[PDB]
DNA sequence: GCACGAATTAAGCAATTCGTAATCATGGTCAT
């Protein structure tokens, strides 16, 4: 517990600093910072450039003096060495040592809003009245829902939690009780006092980080722009503690979003946090989808516009917003993302918003590590954005890979940069570089004997460790240190759990249990008789230590993995194109070289010649088909599938792994690089079930496979674990039953035999018509109907939806239903030949139900239709054909011919 | 004046880039009296021309001095 | 900028190079082309692929600078 | 040739938004007065040719531009 | 990309290639 910063800004020449004092109370200091910069010098000094040149410091009265000095030295073309972002400099000088923090005293705000909008408006174009107030707090852990008692768009009853805490039938709204007590409420006479008290809440309850699902794309713009259109510049500024709250807009290819920054508070979206720090790919990045992914607490699925819900059944309306915010809070509880940003920005000594762009996240850490040796960073120059070779993927043969193993590289670009010794100042000219194909085959001549090399022909020093590799190491070993701490902590937790179930005693003493170190066996033995209370407190301390270790491990991983995307970003400070095209092209040469060596060893062991054993691969991971070795040894000699997986497991370690090591040491020798750091172990083993006809995995194209994975990262699976990517099993345009059937067909075609996939096709054909018509039918957007109508008949290239809607309008003309116009999303399905409507299509507003009079025939005239050939049979054929099989048995006379 | 055919294509853009990559950025700036040299890309046009603007010497590309006059 | 932000129009030049030349000479300027050193240069470089002016990977092996004076 | 170059590249400036004497009204007035002039001489030459040749409703101008007939 | 900045020029399409439909000639077989 110490003093630290919550947000830093700079106005004029004074730098404001929202911070937590040593006592624990938020303060808003503001000091006259004096910039300290650096310049070229011909005189020896302790302050040196990265190249070793002598550098002279300088201290300045005010920041504006430095910003004039830069313009001075930028008119004679002399490098203005030293940090030019005073915010980073201030944090470094203000704290210097490693900063110990406490998330408990930082005020994060979770907010979601729901406007009284009949038609969904633009975030910056406000035309509908705001009614939802939500601002969950961390240091206060209390909701804020002050119900708009009466408004200009009607009056509503009071929101009472006691009646809404039960189930819908009982009068409640399926929202948990333990969160309802958090909610507050007070009435309102209009929206003016609501806005007034909201801005007040912003004043007295001033958050540190303002987050929420898509907060920067919806609530922030809408909330501020309504205040602007109504109140004006007055009160709108109060949002920022210093008043520098500045109109910021970002024109985009999608249109005009007024991406806004509230000065003095870091507006960190949560949607981008999940999009960036999770590596999880779910097709629907809407909040409820990821919630069901993580917390599984889906809402009650009732459809229709919620305008009537605002006045009538407003209790359910408010409960929707309550669970909306609780979903994001639960996502935080399960991932701890804001914990990660807090733990990372203090490590990089930079403002919180910096976590977004890694350019800063590295420009700060390499600086504050270069401060120790008194070395001084260089002025940012000016480069040009260039497209150069990047990632690499082999062309897989769309075949049925039966018994296949896989490996991956532990960290591609960090290890590349360490091994080649690539840095902005470790560059020493080029050599002659032949076409890449020659180097992969190994016949090409050794490029040099004095320096390290990369196959784009630039030669870099060896002995002098670069700044970039040294920083990568200072991150890598810290990562492994914290990981070892976490392993020791989990071992200790297991030991304590095993202690609590045998023996007991009464001893309420709680000594200073050591931290950051595994406890001695005697020390944990002497407190074995601690009953449960103090033992549970110790276990809670162990869990808290595990949480800090986890945060440290994740933030370390993200950092090391981002050095590349930084080093190729034109606006990085240490950018150099040669450096970039020497760590990507070396990646391609490394993967193709290891592929060549895999083939050269597998053709040798198996016996065949000119056989490509690599099934597929990215630049860092490869899948190699190993069916030939399994055939050589024999399938029948085994007794259980576990024997098969164990053989495939130890075959990589005993035989393949040393070959990998030697064939990458040959890379290290080829260009005489510094040292060998690449790793490669069996990331996944795919194998068909023992005895079953099952394919056991197949490819379809570049990066669309399917595998019945049985072992992932040395974790035996008691049951088959399905692993697919790029297939058509997750696209939103198909119904859930269609996707479930597709995934079951995958499970069959992989694990089960042909008869299984054959009979399942017809079973699902029978069952497929036995679902609701609306879920099966797709939806399209219809615009410009008048272009393609002639008395309801098809026009010139009349779209499916247009034809369907014209026929529907001809069907129910004058029947009183709402007309279907342009711009409305309309659900469409075809009809069989000879339907009474005279056309092979039908269309009506989505979600809505068509009139009952035409409901019968449209159901009868679409029975056993062909539409699922356009939905499910086509993808099934696309997979099965590449799987060496066909679903519907094409019987013929072939057995008579032979 | 520093003319020549395609001077702002494969001449200035290369001479300057090479000396920057083999002799460091400091000696490359000796090309100008003011000692101030700059580069701006023009992706607006399909051609990515990293055109340079050495101060003191009026870089006049003869190709573009000919297509105009 | 200080005067513009109040919403009034400034008069004169904003780019002072023309202003300086105008005041320094004013009357008609008499010049002899001979004294103006007009260089000229074409560079030839050799490489496997087309030498990329921006990547600048190959070795400059013919410079052939020309001078007028 | 200097004078020729100066005059020829004038309308390429008064019709530019960064030439300080820019107006939409003027930039359109020059263009469409040119249009009116060319079509006016087109109609007059048609009338004169019809009168001298006696016939009526005969079109002789072909494929002109805002300068040529 | 921080902190702006201080000045500013490439527009709008002619042409091809492909896919899908719409219309139109033309043949195979049938009630006659």
From Swiss-Prot, chain A:
Transmembrane as UniProt keyword: no
Superkingdom assignment: Viruses
Family note: Belongs to the DNA polymerase type-B family.
Residues reported in the UniProt entry to bind Mg(2+) 3: 408, 620
Effect after changing residue 114 to A: Almost complete loss of exonuclease activity. Decreased replication fidelity
Annotated Mg(2+) 2 binding sites: 219, 324
3'-5'exonuclease: region residues: 101-337
Stored Pfam families: DNA_pol_B, DNA_pol_B_exo1
Region called Beta hairpin, residue ranges: 245-261
InterPro entries hit by this protein: DNA-dir_DNA_pol_B, DNA-dir_DNA_pol_B_CS, DNA-dir_DNA_pol_B_exonuc, DNA-dir_DNA_pol_B_multi_dom, DNA/RNA_pol_sf, DNA_pol_palm_dom_sf, DNA_pol_type-B, DPOL_T4
Reactions listed under catalytic activity: DNA(n) + a 2'-deoxyribonucleoside 5'-triphosphate = DNA(n+1) + diphosphate
GO biological process: bidirectional double-stranded viral DNA replication; DNA-templated DNA replication
SUPFAM superfamilies named in the record: DNA/RNA polymerases, Ribonuclease H-like
Function: Replicates the viral genomic DNA. This polymerase possesses two enzymatic activities: DNA synthesis (polymerase) and an exonucleolytic activity that degrades single-stranded DNA in the 3'- to 5'-direction for proofreading purpose.
Region of interest called Interaction with the polymerase clamp, as start-end residue ranges on this chain: 893-898
Site (Essential for viral replication): 711
Site (Optimization of metal coordination by the polymerase active site): 618, 703
Protein name in the entry: DNA-directed DNA polymerase
SMART domains per the UniProt record, alphabetical: POLBc (SM00486)
EC numbers on record: 2.7.7.7, 3.1.11.-
GO molecular function: 3'-5' exonuclease activity; DNA binding; DNA-directed DNA polymerase activity; metal ion binding; nucleotide binding
Annotated binding of Mg(2+) 1, by residue: 112, 114, 324
Stretches the record annotates as Binding of DNA in B-conformation: 702-705
Residues holding substrate: 411-413, 479, 557
Organism this protein belongs to: Enterobacteria phage T4 (Bacteriophage T4)
Keywords from the UniProt entry: DNA replication, DNA-binding, DNA-directed DNA polymerase, Exonuclease, Hydrolase, Magnesium, Metal-binding, Multifunctional enzyme, Nuclease, Nucleotidyltransferase, Transferase, Viral DNA replication
